[PDB]
Every structure is written in C-alpha cells, then in structure tokens.
Design a protein around this nucleic acid. Structure first.
Ligand code: MG
Ligand code: MG
Ligand code: MG
Ligand code: MG
Ligand code: MG
Ligand code: MG
Ligand code: MG
Ligand code: MG
Ligand code: MG
Ligand code: MG
Ligand code: MG
Ligand code: MG
Ligand code: MG
Ligand code: MG
Ligand code: MG
Ligand code: MG
Ligand code: MG
Ligand code: MG
Ligand code: MG
Ligand code: MG
Ligand code: MG
Ligand code: MG
Ligand code: MG
Ligand code: MG
Ligand code: MG
Ligand code: MG
Ligand code: MG
Ligand code: MG
Ligand code: MG
Ligand code: MG
Lengths: 208, 177, 132, 343, 328
RNA sequence: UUCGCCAGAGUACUACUCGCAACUGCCUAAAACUCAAAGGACUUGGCGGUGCUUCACAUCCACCUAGAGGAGCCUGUUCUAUAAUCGAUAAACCCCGAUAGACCUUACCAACCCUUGCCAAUUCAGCCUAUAUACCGCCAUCUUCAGCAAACCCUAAAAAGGAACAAUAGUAAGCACAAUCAUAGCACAUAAAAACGUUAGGUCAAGGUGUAGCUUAUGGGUUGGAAAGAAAUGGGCUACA
C-alpha cells in the first residue's frame, strides 16, 4: 500500500524496448507512458531480466516456500530440476536409436507439459439452494486452473511420500508421471471431472 | 386560473384573450404607484424568475438605478433580513413582478413574503397567475418578447421621469430660499 | 472516548482559553509545554526531584493567588534559579500584589534553597480564544 | 498528604454530580435540588485563624507616618471577628433559604395566565413597553430520537397585547423553558391582529364561529357585565382591551384551536360603518334604557338610498337551542347563576 | 473593522522599524524574508505545526478579506444585485453573459458581412492553462460560493471560449486562468567525471530497507564487482543476490564493460543486494544515452523502494495480526 | 322533507323471553361483576425471515495462507477444598487491574499489643466500610458512522418537517469529519484523531469524594500462614518430523 494509485507496473522485457522502430501501434503507447508523468513501481527482487528464469518456475517456487525461507525453496527447485535432468539422462542412455528421438531431456519443457496435463478443465462451486449445498460445475479461469494444477502436485508430494523420501526426488518422480499422464494428480483431476459430469444437471443453479 | 375570470375578454378557440381595457386601467395606476415610490426615495426591486430574459431584467434595473432579483430566491431573504443580507438593512419598498410564476409553475416566494412584510407589490399576471396577493396587478402577457420589452421600457421610463423630476423639484427647493 | 486533559463542549457559551481548547495530542504540535527543565532530557537525571517541586509550585501558587489566576503557571528552570511566569487578573490592588510577590520570592527561595524569580502579567480578564 | 488535594471546582463537580450518567435519560429528579456554594465569597485574603495582622493585606501600610510591623489580634478581638464571619453565614443562608414568590395566573401550580413581562425590543430599536403578555399553554412535548430516546422539548402558546385593540399569539418551542418563553415573546409580536371594539368595551355584534372542532359563541354584553368568559378568553380579551363580554365554548377545548378561532372571529367582525357603507342605510341604535330614542352610531357616507330594506314579517335567522333555552327561562342548571369573583 | 486594520497597519510599520533597529540591518532594505528570519531567531518556538509559530506579516496577509460597506447612510445599497445574496458572483455571471451576447451579436454581423478575422484561442495546452478552483474563486469573490454555482460559471466560461474571440473578452477570461508547472519527471544526469588519471568514472547512491549503498563505477575496466573489499561471489553466495546484481548490467548490455566497487552498510542479505541494484542503476545513467534511461526507469531500476517494515501497534501481534478474538 | 340507529369499554354476534319447516340454528336482546379508561387518525424513531438499486476488500460467499479445539508445559478463569482478599466476568472478561505475590507489596486470616494514636492545633485523627444505581478524574463500545448543535425564518398548526441546481424555504457561528501535524525530501501508507449520545458498561481498591455507617474498633503495629486439584475452559510456548 506504500505505492500510490499513480504508480504503474514495470516492464522487464528487454526486447520490448530494444526494437521501437519496427512498429507504430506499439510506438504510440510508450511515449505517452512517460509523457503523462506517470510513476513506475520498483522492480521486485524475485523478478529479473534473466533469460533462464520462468514466471511459472518462480510461482511454483513461491508456492513451496514455508514461512519466509526463500533460499530453501530455490534450492529445492535446483535439486528438483537437476534430478529430473539426471533421471531423464539415465533413461536416455539405456534406450535404442529410435527412442532417443522421442525422449525429452529438457526439464523446463517437461515441467510445463506436466502442468498443462495436470490443468483441470472445469471446476466445482458449492451453491446453497433450498438450505443445502450443491456442487455446481463452473468453468474456471486460466489462473485458477493453473493454480489448482500447481497446488495439487505440491500437496500430493508433501503428504503422500515416505519420510526417507526427499522432496526433489519425489517431485522428480511425479513430474515424469504427470508428463505421461500416469500420475495421481491426473487421477485427482479426472475425479473432479467425473464429479462435475455427475452433477452436470445441477449446472442450472448458477446465475453467472 | 379561477381568479382571472373578470380580467379576460373571452376565449379564441381554446386560447383565452385578455381584454386590454382593464389592462390599461390597471397599468395607469401601476405606473403611477411605481413612479411615486421612486419620487419619494423608495427602494424598488424587480423580482422575476424566468430563464429567458433575466439578462434583460438586470440591464433594465441597472439603467433605472433600482435593484433586481432574477436568480434563485433564497428562503429567508425578505423575512430573515437581519441574517441573510446584513445586520441592519432596508427592506425594498416596492416589488415589481415580471413573472409571478417560477420554473415549477408555482406562485413565487416573494409575492408571499411581500404580503407578509407589508411590502407593496405590482405585478404582471398572466392567465395562470394568482392576483389575490399582488397589491397592483396588471393582466397581461409575460411570455412574449415584445410584451415583456414593452413592460420593461414602460417601467424604465416611469422610474427615469420620477427621479429626474425629483431632481428639478429639489433644484427649485434650493432657489426657494 | 478519550477524556484526558479535555474540556467538554457545551451548548456554545462557555469561554475556553487556548491551553484548554487543545487536546493533549496537540502538545509540541500546536501548544507548548508549561514547564521547561533539563531532567526530561536523554542523558540527564533528577527528573522526579524537579517534578515534585513543579507540582508543589502549581498548588502553592494556586492557593496564594485565589481566584485571580488566569492561566496555568509557566515554570522556567535556568541555572539554579527558577522563574515563575504567571497571568493574573487585576482583582487585587497593587499594594497587595507587591506584598505577595515579595513574600513568595523569599519563602520559595528559603524552601527550595535556590533563587526564585516571580513575574506577573496583569490581564483585564480571562482571554478567550474559542467560542464564548 | 498535601499532594492528594484538588481544586474546589473539581470537588464540586463530583459533589453535585450534575453530569451523572443516571441523570441523562431522566432517572434522576427524585431529589430535585442542586446548590453549589462558593467558599471564597466573604473570604478576605489576609485574615487567618491565628488572627495575624499583615501590613500588606489586612491593615494599611502606614500609620501616624511610621511603618507598621506584624501584629496579632487579641483573644477577644479575634473572637469578635469570628462571630462576625459566622453571622455572615447565617445572613447568607437566610437569603438563600427564602423563595422569591410569583403571581398565579389560573391555579397555584400552572403556567397559564401568569405575567411574563414586556417582550424584548426589535433589531431596529422599537421597544414594546405598553405591550403585555400572558402564558396561555405550556406542554412538555416528547420526541423519539434514535440514540437519546425521549427528547424533551418545552412548548408554550403565548399571546401578547397592549390594551388598545392590537393583540396576537404565537408558539415558542425549545429544549429549555426559559428559551421557549423568550422565543414565544419575540415571535408573538410579529403576528398582531387588530380587534374592532365597539365603544372600546364590547364587540360590535354577536359572533358564532366554527373552528376545526371548537365552537365559540360570543354575545355582545352591556357595560355592567364584565368578562364572564372562559378562563383563557378572559385573559386574551384583557390583553386586547375588551372589558365587557360573554363567551361560551363547546366541543373541543384545545387551547391552540381556541385561541386561533377566537382571533379569527374577533378579526372577522363587521363595523357599523362598514354595514352602513355596504347597505347605504343609516345605522340607528335603540338603547333599552334610553327608551325609543333613535341613537345614531354610524352614518352611510356616500350615496344614501331612499329605497327601504325589505321588512321580513318572519325572520329566517339561524337560531340556537342554547339561546332559546336561555331566553325561555328553562336554564335550571345550578352552574349558570353562580356568584364568581370580579375581573 | 476598517479602522482596526488601519491601526494594525501603523503598528506593523513601527514594529518593522523597531525590528530593523534590533537586528542592526537597514530598515529600507529590510524585507519580509528578513522579518521571517528575525522572528525565527528571536522567538525560537519548536512546534511541528508551522502556523503555530510566531508570525509577523502584513495585516492584509494575516486577516481575511473583509466585506465592504454594502449600503450608504440613507439605507440604499450600492450594487444593484445586493438583494440576490451573492452580489459579486451574480455580477460576474451577469457580466459574462453580457459579453457572451456582445460576442454573439458581433459575430452575427461579421458573418452577415462575410468577414472571418478571428482565430481559435481556446487551446492553451503548451502553456498549461487551467481553470480556477473554488478556493481561487472564493479569494476573489469574498463571499462564500457553492459547488453548483462554480460549475455553472465554469460551464459559461467554456461557452465563451468556444466562440470567436476578440480583444477584450480574451483578456477578461485570461484572469480566470492559472498556469501549471512542468510535470516533467526527467531525472538529473550526473556528468561523467575524471579523477586522478582515470577515465569513465561515475558514482551512485542507493537505499532500500535500511541499507545504504555507494557504487563507484569505471567504464574503462573489465566486468567485475568488488563489494566491501571482497568479491561479489563471496559477498553474495545466494544466486538471487547475484541475479539482482546482474539485473542493471544485463538490461544495458554492460556486463563485461564496467568495473565496479560497491560499499553497502545495514540491512540483511537481500536488502544490501537491492540497495546495490538501485545505486548501480542510478550510477549507470552517465555511460548511456537518454533514450535508455527512460527504458530503465520504466523497467523499475531508477525508482526507490518505499516498502519498509511497519511499526507494531499496541494490542496486536505483527502490526496486522490481531489477538485471538473470542466472541463469547 | 323523511325513515332506521347511536348514551364509556369488557362482559356480549352472551343468558333469559317471543317468533321461525330452522332442535349444535336464525332475529330481538340484557344483568351481576371488573377498569378508568376503551377507541379513530397522525409525527418521529426502531424493526421487518417485504421488495428494489449500489456494495462488503481481510470480507459474507465464491477463494489463498498460517493457527485454535487433539498432546505436554506456562498462565488466567469457573468449580470443589481451606482460618484465608477484591474487582472484570456477551461482542467491549479470561498473561484482565498486575510493564508482575517468600516477609514487604497485601487491602485476607489466626495469634498477640496500642487506643486524641503521621500533622502546629482541632468533642480530633484514622477506615482498601457500603453505594460505580450519586461522582469527578480515566477508558471500552457503535466508531474511520457522520452527525450533533446555539441564534433565526417558513408551514391554511407546527407531534414535527424544511430538499429539487434548467433549484419548489431555507441562512447558519461552533463541535465533528475533512484539512493539517508525526514516522525529519514528496506521494501512498501507518500512527494519531473521531463530536452529541447508547450500554444506569468498567473503576469508591490510582487519587479526592456526596450520602449512610465504625471510634479501647469496620482504627493502628509485630509474628506465622494464605494450601491442594475431583473436574471443565480461554490465551500462548514446544513439537508431532
Ligand atoms: Mg405566462
Ligand atoms: Mg398550590
Ligand atoms: Mg376536556
Ligand atoms: Mg508474526
Ligand atoms: Mg354497557
Ligand atoms: Mg352470526
Ligand atoms: Mg344467539
Ligand atoms: Mg476473516
Ligand atoms: Mg503453533
Ligand atoms: Mg490443546
Ligand atoms: Mg479472584
Ligand atoms: Mg464480582
Ligand atoms: Mg459487557
Ligand atoms: Mg505479614
Ligand atoms: Mg504476604
Ligand atoms: Mg482495614
Ligand atoms: Mg456506570
Ligand atoms: Mg455533513
Ligand atoms: Mg422545526
Ligand atoms: Mg453550521
Ligand atoms: Mg512530510
Ligand atoms: Mg492522506
Ligand atoms: Mg487509532
Ligand atoms: Mg482528521
Ligand atoms: Mg452497572
Ligand atoms: Mg461492577
Ligand atoms: Mg475512597
Ligand atoms: Mg469496595
Ligand atoms: Mg489450564
Ligand atoms: Mg490476551
């Protein structure tokens, strides 16, 4: 709240500024952006101009952090990506010439595909009608869908692992499972979809 | 209005016509009374709530040297004088109504307040006006630009002659001794 | 509702002085302190020894000048000598004013073992700042 | 133990408890007295219980041209001074315990009919010294406010008059009784009626008026019949200047409506001069005592018509069973012919 | 109250002469700023509200504008709009409408004669002209005003300005115009300095969360950062702390083209990195042209961080976390 | 111009009569006894599980995070138990008076001593005796709600209300809000402020106190003790990895 309503959100993209002359529709916005005497917020410490960082990676690291220990969560991402990489490399080196053209070695792509596979399509909202709560199926927003996909995996890896099992190793298992659509988070998703299909007839209770 | 029956000549296909015989008979007394107050150093105020000619009313009043009120009439203007205008003020000795009705088509505040404060009121009353409280009513037309300009010019010259003849009367008073 | 050092608003006829018209949350903002000394500083001492004398001076002057005290005392403390600035109504004759000022300037000095100055400012009446 | 003492103002503020939490809504008034005494009333500064005489406070500075030293009164002189300061307290208590009395208007514990004094002068400088006012009605009206609940406003209906025929009435309402009295006095002058009084003692003609729900019948009365009217109409007519009148009120006896109807009827009178003007005929009074003598009261100024009025063999008048009973002597009620006090 | 103000005038003048005598300055050259300094020295009242300080100004500055006498000794008011409540406001409105009608008649005659010699003077954007607020109209028209009446007056001024303007009415409207300052928020660029046989030298200051940082930048050296006498890798073992350091350099493509020494005091591990980031951004302005400074400030490198720790409040836990509130 | 009714309310579209194809019925229709009221319309608050618009920004849901209620400990209450304080005890009490209990603190109790007994004096001192439902001083609450309110004016009477901006009776000092000030540059934010009143809200035990009560005692000193938890609960700390 220390930032007033006049303060606007900063822009981190370098390519946005490096080529101003190639377009006029976007040329017409940034000159007014600074000619309107508009103040700009300070850039957050978590977001930088790195080419190796992803907003999805940063969000998933933020969601794992317990308390305020950010370095521990950053580490846990380090070993999670490293373990996914090394397990995929061990699988890479044990196959025949045909499978190396299909097996992916990129942890970022594997993580993004796992999140897309874990992303639900429809959600449920409790609606009170006649003194009882009915689970009405409702379309979810993109941010809600991705938040559910992320939270389901984090919750599953937090509780359904053995005490000797470490978080990066368990997450490396479930990432490869969710990439191929064989993980328990996919089962949770399909459970929500089935419970929405069973109450499809109750969707008329929604008024929006 | 129910009280305009004696002040009308008849009805020309729905539109009522005001006879000008009693209009002129009333206007003679109206102008005489207006001129006498100005002659005897009286405050004369033109009250008129009509958003078409208000500028003309302030121009006429400024040329006459009298006062005007054509804007929104406040509540305790004439009654609560020691508060709205100043600690001790002089109430207007005569009120001229060019439009007895406001924009709501209700009787004006000043016609009631002048009767409350015993202030003479001379007024141009239309067929929808109420002349019961106006001391000197003149049945006429207040919506025609020529009619209102005629009335404004008549009341301008009535004040001008009164003031000038007061000045020559004082000039002869000085030569009396 | 806060009620400390606050005179409540009447129907609109009470005369209130500048000191009483301001709530305690205005001290050092709109009005100043009635007493000045060094004991309330950071690395200084002997605050209570001066505070007890301050309270005793308030009460003693209130009793010494009965009904003619306009505002509260201003107690200045500067190099072993304490000055008392008072606002007094012109109810007593100057002969009785001069008896009491000379009485206090020696009684207080002999009771506190320190020089005491007494300065009186005579006002025709209590000066009113807010509504009256 | 000296630092435990406070200021006399703070002591009294707690002693009287004028700002108590129970006295706000109205739970108080059980012991309806709040007296605060100033202890510094007759306290000379220099005097003390030891009887010391100080040259600056008690005794003058110089005597016989020489300076006075500190003295002390003798035991008996100090006792004489003590007796004086004690007897001052009995004198002040004698002044305090006596109540200044007040004229009763209609009863010993009502505000109706009491004198309130001349009203306050106007802003331009007009002073109403000949005017007199009397309280007609007092009422503790209550309103329902969200926070305080019962809001008590004293409302008074008050009429003013000078005795020369000009009188009026108005209502003043305020939180305080004194403020309501002042408001009524200052607002009654602005609404003044003029009452046409025939020969300055009685009304011109009998008036039978019908107000909202109050019927008033007033009959013209002789010189020897002084104000046998209602107890409020008598006060109003005493303020107006009417000395001889008889009035009977029937139906509702509401004070506000009674005053409004009385003033409306007294203002709607018809003068003999206006009757002569409107009928173009001479107004001739036939006194019972003066026999058949044609006493002329008003002359029809202007054109005097020679055509006489249609003589009605049988008059079509609006009679009343009350006055018919009075004329036929059937009024056997014991409440009509009693002996009452004078005006 | 006119005579009271007149006496205050002479009292203020004699006080000004005596104040000049006290200070020993020339009373002829003694001005209001000198009065302010003299009062601030003689009467050093330490109060947080500046209006409570002792002030000695001109009586027409201290006292508000007083209404003049509205009527003569015969009782007749001077102005013809006295009985309207607001004689000054309604006179202003009447004059504005009279000039509007005059302009309308003149333009009608010019159009009848087929003469178009007027121009559009309504657009005063390069001057930064604005309309008077209710306070600026209330200091002119001494009597109190209303918001709706002020809006009516402004809307009438717009109608007047939307018509072909002559000579006098433009000047009449110009007194109801206020000029704004340049809201240009461009920063001051520190000039490139040369110190002791060293080229491409500059300095920067940053502060974030009680951490003060000074950065000394050389544009002629290789890419390295020396923090408090030790290397940046040793001082910031965390990857994010070094990402903060690379954030200003990578944006301007000056990674290996500048040699920098950072000295930071206070704060924690990330507060020092943020302060060094801000100082480095403020220092790299000199080595770049103007079009990239705006890109950088729009990326957020040149704006400080006012996100500071809030003070704990009594009765609460962490200045927001309240105690366990039991309903029953 | 007429006809039929109306004499406080409850008793009472009742009992007893007459008449009637009606036999749990219809019409006419009292009295004993009880009260000083019973009634009609209206003004303003308050309320509405009436209805319609704009909302909730830590706030109701939709939704996010960390916890309580489960265990141990600390501590505060309600209960039993003792010779053994008191007050708070719905939001607005429960690590609250108390930023603080071995004697002191301590006002509680049991044993013992002194009674013009702190002060210059006082048929005087002294009382933590009762009344917070007499108070002042200090606060909680609605409450980051905006209203309160002196002097006036108006209403075909007035309990009360007072507004139409192309304006239809409203001016209005002042207290609030707002503004300003502090967190040492602005902005934001925080802090602070929040009037009149509601809860007869808390405090005679910070201190003084009106009233009613003690004076070889309900006053003043010394010593020793003020446990313990069958059990219930509130708030925190430690964790359950
Ligand atoms: Mg008309
Ligand atoms: Mg009696
Ligand atoms: Mg009666
Ligand atoms: Mg915390
Ligand atoms: Mg009966
Ligand atoms: Mg029936
Ligand atoms: Mg029956
Ligand atoms: Mg919540
Ligand atoms: Mg915990
Ligand atoms: Mg537990
Ligand atoms: Mg207890
Ligand atoms: Mg209790
Ligand atoms: Mg409670
Ligand atoms: Mg003991
Ligand atoms: Mg103990
Ligand atoms: Mg005791
Ligand atoms: Mg209480
Ligand atoms: Mg407001
Ligand atoms: Mg009213
Ligand atoms: Mg006001
Ligand atoms: Mg500041
Ligand atoms: Mg602000
Ligand atoms: Mg606060
Ligand atoms: Mg404020
Ligand atoms: Mg209570
Ligand atoms: Mg209690
Ligand atoms: Mg006590
Ligand atoms: Mg007690
Ligand atoms: Mg417990
Ligand atoms: Mg707590």
């Amino acid at each position: 709240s220390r930032y007033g309503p006049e303060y606007k959100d900063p822009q981190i993209d370098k390519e946005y500024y490096r080529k101003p002359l190639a377009e006029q529709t976007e040329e017409e916005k940034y000159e007014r952006d600074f000619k309107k005497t508009q103040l700009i917020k300070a850039a957050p410490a978590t977001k930088t101009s790195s080419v190796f960082e992803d907003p999805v990676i940063s969000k998933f690291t933020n969601m794992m952090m317990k308390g305020g220990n950010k370095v521990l969560a950053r580490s846990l991402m380090t070993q999670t990506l490293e373990a996914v990489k090394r397990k995929q490399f061990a699988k890479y080196h044990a196959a025949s010439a045909e499978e190396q053209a299909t097996i992916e070695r990129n942890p970022y792509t594997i993580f993004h595909q796992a999140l897309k596979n874990c992303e639900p399509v429809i959600g449920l909202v409790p609606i009170l009608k006649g003194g009882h709560f009915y689970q009405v199926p409702v379309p979810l927003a993109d941010r809600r869908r991705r938040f559910l996909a992320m939270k389901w995996m984090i919750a599953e890896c937090r509780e359904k692992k053995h005490r000797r099992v470490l978080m990066p190793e368990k997450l490396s298992q479930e990432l490869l499972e969710a990439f191929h659509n064989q993980g328990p988070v996919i089962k949770r998703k399909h459970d929500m979809h089935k419970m929405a299909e069973a109450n499809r007839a109750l969707a008329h209770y929604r008024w929006w | 209005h129910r009280f305009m029956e004696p002040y009308l000549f008849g009805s020309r296909l729905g539109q009522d016509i005001i006879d000008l015989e009693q209009t002129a008979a009333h206007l003679q007394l109206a102008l005489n009374f207006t001129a006498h107050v100005a002659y005897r150093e009286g405050i004369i105020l033109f009250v008129s709530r009509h958003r078409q000619f208000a500028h003309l009313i302030e121009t006429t009043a400024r040329d006459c040297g009298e006062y005007a009120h054509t804007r929104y009439f406040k509540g305790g203007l004439l009654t609560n004088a020691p508060l709205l205008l100043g600690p001790g003020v002089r109430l207007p000795d005569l009120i001229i109504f060019l439009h007895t009705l406001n924009n709501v088509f209700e009787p004006h505040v000043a016609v009631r307040d002048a009767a409350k404060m015993n202030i003479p009121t001379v007024g141009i009353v239309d067929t929808n006006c109420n002349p019961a409280l106006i001391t000197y009513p003149v049945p006429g037309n207040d919506d025609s630009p020529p009619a209102v300009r005629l009335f404004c010019r008549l009341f301008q010259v009535a004040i001008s002659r009164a003031k000038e003849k007061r000045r020559q009367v004082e000039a002869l008073y000085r030569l009396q001794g | 509702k806060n009620r400390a050092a606050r005179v409540r608003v009447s129907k609109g006829d009470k005369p209130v002085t500048y000191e009483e018209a301001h709530a305690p949350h205005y001290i050092a903002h709109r009005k100043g302190w009635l007493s000045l000394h060094t004991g309330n500083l950071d690395g200084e001492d002997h605050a209570a020894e001066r505070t007890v004398e301050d309270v005793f001076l308030r009460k003693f002057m209130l009793g010494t000048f009965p009904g003619c005290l306009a505002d509260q005392l201003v107690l200045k403390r500067r190099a072993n000598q304490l000055e008392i600035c008072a606002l007094v109504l012109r109810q007593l004759p100057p002969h009785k004013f001069y008896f009491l000022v000379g009485y206090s300037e020696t009684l207080l000095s002999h009771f506190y073992k320190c020089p005491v100055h007494l300065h009186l400012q005579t006002v025709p009446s209590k000066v009113v700042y807010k509504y009256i | 133990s000296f630092f435990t003492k406070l200021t006399a103002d703070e002591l009294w503020k707690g002693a009287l408890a004028e700002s108590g939490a129970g006295a706000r809504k109205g739970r108080g008034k059980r012991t309806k007295k709040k007296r605060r005494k100033d202890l510094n009333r007759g306290q000379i500064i220099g005097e003390g219980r030891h009887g010391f005489l100080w040259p600056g406070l008690n005794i003058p500075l110089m005597r016989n041209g020489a300076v006075q030293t500190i003295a002390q009164r003798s035991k008996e002189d100090q006792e004489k001074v003590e007796a004086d300061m004690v007897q001052q307290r009995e004198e002040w208590d004698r002044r305090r315990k006596m109540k200044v009395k007040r004229e009763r208007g209609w009863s010993g514990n009502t505000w109706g009919g009491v004198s309130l004094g001349p009203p306050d002068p106007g802003p331009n400088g007009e002073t109403y010294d000949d005017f007199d006012t009397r309280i007609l009605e007092v009422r503790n009206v209550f309103n329902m406010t969200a926070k305080e609940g019962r809001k008590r406003s004293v409302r008074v209906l008050v009429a003013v008059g000078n005795g020369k025929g000009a009188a009026g009435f108005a209502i003043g309402k305020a939180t305080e009784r004194a403020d309501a009295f002042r408001k009524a006095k200052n607002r009654a002058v602005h609404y003044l009626h003029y009452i046409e009084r025939y020969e300055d003692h009685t009304i011109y003609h009998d008036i039978s008026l019908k107000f909202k729900r109050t019927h008033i019948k007033m009959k013209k009365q002789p010189r020897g019949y002084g104000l046998h009217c209602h107890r409020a109409i008598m006060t109003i007519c005493r303020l107006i200047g009417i000395k001889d009148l008889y009035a009977k009120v029937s139906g509702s006896v509401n004070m506000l409506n009674l005053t409004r109807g009385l003033f409306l009827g007294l203002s709607r009178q018809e003068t003999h001069q206006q009757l002569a003007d409107k009928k173009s005929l001479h107004v001739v009074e036939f006194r019972e005592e003066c026999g058949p003598l044609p006493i002329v009261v008003a002359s029809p100024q202007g054109a005097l018509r020679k055509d006489p009025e249609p003589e009605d063999e049988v008059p079509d008048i609006t009679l009343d069973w009350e006055d018919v009973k009075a004329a036929q002597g059937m009024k056997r009620s014991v409440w009509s012919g009693l002996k009452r006090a004078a005006t | 109250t006119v005579d009271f103000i007149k006496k205050q005038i002479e009292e203020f003048n004699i006080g000004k002469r005596h104040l000049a005598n006290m200070m020993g300055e020339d009373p002829e050259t003694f001005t209001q700023e000198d009065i302010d300094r003299a009062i601030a020295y003689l009467f050093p009242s330490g109060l947080f509200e500046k209006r409570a300080r002792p002030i000695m100004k001109h009586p027409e500055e201290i006292f508000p504008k007083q209404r003049a006498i509205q009527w003569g000794e015969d009782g007749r008011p001077f102005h013809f709009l006295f009985y309207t409540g607001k004689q000054s406001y309604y006179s202003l409105m009447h004059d504005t409408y009279g000039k509007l009608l005059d302009v309308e008649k003149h333009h009608n005659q010019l159009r009848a004669k087929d003469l178009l010699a007027e121009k559009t003077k309504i657009l005063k954007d390069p001057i930064g002209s604005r309309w008077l607020i209710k306070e600026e109209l209330e200091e002119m028209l001494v009597e109190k005003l209303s918001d709706q009446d002020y809006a009516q007056f402004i809307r009438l001024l717009e109608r007047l300005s939307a018509l072909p303007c002559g000579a006098t009415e433009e000047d009449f409207v110009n007194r109801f115009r206020r000029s704004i300052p340049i809201q240009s928020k461009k920063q001051l660029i520190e000039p490139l300095q040369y110190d002791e046989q060293g080229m491409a030298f500059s300095r920067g200051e940053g502060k974030r969360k009680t951490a003060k940082a000074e950065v000394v930048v050389y544009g002629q050296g290789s890419g390295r950062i020396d923090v408090n006498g030790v290397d940046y890798l040793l001082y910031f073992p965390v990857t994010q702390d070094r990402e903060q350091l690379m954030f200003p350099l990578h944006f301007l493509d000056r990674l290996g083209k500048h040699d920098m020494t950072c000295a930071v005091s206070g704060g924690g591990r990330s507060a020092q990195a943020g302060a060094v980031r801000l100082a480095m951004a403020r220092a790299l302005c000199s080595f770049v042209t103007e079009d990239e400074v705006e890109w950088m400030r729009q990326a957020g490198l040149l704006t400080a961080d006012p996100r500071v720790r809030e003070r704990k409040k009594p009765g609460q836990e962490g200045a927001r976390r309240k105690f366990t509130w039991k309903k029953r």
